[PDB]
Short mmCIF file of C-alpha atoms in Angstrom, two decimals:
data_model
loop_
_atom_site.label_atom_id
_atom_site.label_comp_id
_atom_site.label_asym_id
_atom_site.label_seq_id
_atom_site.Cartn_x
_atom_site.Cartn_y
_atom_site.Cartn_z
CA UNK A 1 50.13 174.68 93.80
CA UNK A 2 46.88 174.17 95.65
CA UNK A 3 45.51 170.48 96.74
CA UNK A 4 47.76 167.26 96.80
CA UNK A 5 51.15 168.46 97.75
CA UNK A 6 53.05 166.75 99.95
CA UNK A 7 52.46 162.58 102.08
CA UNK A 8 54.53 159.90 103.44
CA UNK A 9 52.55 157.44 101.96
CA UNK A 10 54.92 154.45 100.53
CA UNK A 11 56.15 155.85 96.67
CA UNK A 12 57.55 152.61 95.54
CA UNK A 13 58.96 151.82 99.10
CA UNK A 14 60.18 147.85 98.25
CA UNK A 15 61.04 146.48 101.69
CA UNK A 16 58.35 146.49 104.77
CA UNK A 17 55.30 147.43 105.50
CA UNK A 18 54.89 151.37 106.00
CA UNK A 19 54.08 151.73 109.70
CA UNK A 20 50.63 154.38 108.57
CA UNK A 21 50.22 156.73 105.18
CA UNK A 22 50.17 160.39 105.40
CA UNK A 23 48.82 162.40 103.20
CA UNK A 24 48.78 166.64 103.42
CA UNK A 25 46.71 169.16 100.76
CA UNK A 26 47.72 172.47 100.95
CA UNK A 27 44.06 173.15 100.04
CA UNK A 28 41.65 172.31 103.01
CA UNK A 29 39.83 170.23 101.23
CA UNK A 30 37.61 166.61 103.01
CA UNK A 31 34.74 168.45 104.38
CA UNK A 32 33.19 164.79 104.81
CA UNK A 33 32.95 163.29 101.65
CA UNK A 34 36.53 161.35 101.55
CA UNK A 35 38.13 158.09 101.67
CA UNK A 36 40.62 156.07 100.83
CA UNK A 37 41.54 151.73 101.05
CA UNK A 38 44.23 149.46 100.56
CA UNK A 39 44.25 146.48 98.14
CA UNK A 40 47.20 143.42 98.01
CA UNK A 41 48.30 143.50 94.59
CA UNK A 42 50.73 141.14 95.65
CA UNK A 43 51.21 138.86 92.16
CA UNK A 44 49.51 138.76 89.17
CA UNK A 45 49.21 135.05 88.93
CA UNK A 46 45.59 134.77 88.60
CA UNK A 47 44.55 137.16 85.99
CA UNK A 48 45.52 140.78 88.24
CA UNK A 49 42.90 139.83 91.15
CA UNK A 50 44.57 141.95 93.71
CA UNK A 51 42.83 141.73 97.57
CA UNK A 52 41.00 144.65 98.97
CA UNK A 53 42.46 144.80 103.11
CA UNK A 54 40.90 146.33 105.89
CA UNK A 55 42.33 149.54 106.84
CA UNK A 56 40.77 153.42 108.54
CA UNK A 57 41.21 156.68 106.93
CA UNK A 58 41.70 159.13 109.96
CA UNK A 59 43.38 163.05 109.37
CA UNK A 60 45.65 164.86 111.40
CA UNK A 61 44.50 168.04 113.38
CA UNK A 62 43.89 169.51 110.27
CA UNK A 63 41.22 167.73 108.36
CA UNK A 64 43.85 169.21 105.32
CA UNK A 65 46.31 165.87 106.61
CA UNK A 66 44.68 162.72 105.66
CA UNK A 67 46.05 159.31 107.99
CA UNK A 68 45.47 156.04 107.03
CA UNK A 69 46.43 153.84 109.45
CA UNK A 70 45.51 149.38 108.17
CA UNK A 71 43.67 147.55 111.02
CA UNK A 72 45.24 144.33 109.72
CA UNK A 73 49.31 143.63 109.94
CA UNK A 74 50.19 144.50 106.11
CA UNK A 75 52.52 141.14 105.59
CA UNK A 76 54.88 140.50 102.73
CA UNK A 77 53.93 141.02 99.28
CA UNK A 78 52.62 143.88 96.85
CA UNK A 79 50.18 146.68 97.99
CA UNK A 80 48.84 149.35 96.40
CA UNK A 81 46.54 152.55 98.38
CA UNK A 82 43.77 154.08 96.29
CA UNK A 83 43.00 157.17 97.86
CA UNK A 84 39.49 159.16 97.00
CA UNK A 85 40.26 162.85 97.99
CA UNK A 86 37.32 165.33 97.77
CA UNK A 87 35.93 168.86 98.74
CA UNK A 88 32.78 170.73 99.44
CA UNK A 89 32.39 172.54 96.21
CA UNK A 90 33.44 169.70 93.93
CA UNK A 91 37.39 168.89 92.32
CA UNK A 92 38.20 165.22 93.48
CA UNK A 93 41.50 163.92 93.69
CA UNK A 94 41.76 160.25 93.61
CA UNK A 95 45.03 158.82 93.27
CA UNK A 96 46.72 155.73 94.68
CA UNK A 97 50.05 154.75 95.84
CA UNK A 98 52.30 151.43 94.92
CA UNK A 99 54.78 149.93 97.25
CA UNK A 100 56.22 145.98 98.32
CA UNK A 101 56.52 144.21 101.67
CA UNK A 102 59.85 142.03 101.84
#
């Protein structure tokens, strides 16, 4: 199928931080209106006020491979990626990805 097809993101990976998250579209989609971020959904406790991180989308050679690489040391806890993929002519795909930090 075209678009999202394959990553190495973190899909439900419970144990460490994943070292960067890869993302490939068979479809050359990101002309330049892409992004994606990284929020701590660590716990609950306080009504599901998860903590937006600081991390930079990058791509591979092909601007078809989407990197994100976080600027800060992803510690212990519960993290979720929202991802924004788009094209030139229109189709988004945003998505996200859930994963834990032991």
């Amino acid at each position: 199928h075209p678009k999202l097809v394959s990553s190495t993101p973190a899909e439900g990976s419970e144990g460490a931080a994943p070292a960067k998250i890869e993302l490939h579209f068979s479809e050359n989609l990101v002309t330049q209106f892409s992004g994606a971020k990284l929020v701590m959904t660590a716990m609950p406790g306080m009504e599901h006020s998860p903590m937006a991180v600081k991390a930079a989308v990058s791509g591979g050679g092909d601007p078809k491979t989407m990197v994100i690489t976080p600027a800060s040391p992803l510690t212990a806890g519960t993290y979720k990626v929202d991802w924004r993929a788009v094209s030139s002519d229109t189709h988004p795909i945003t998505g996200s990805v859930t994963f834990k930090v032991k």
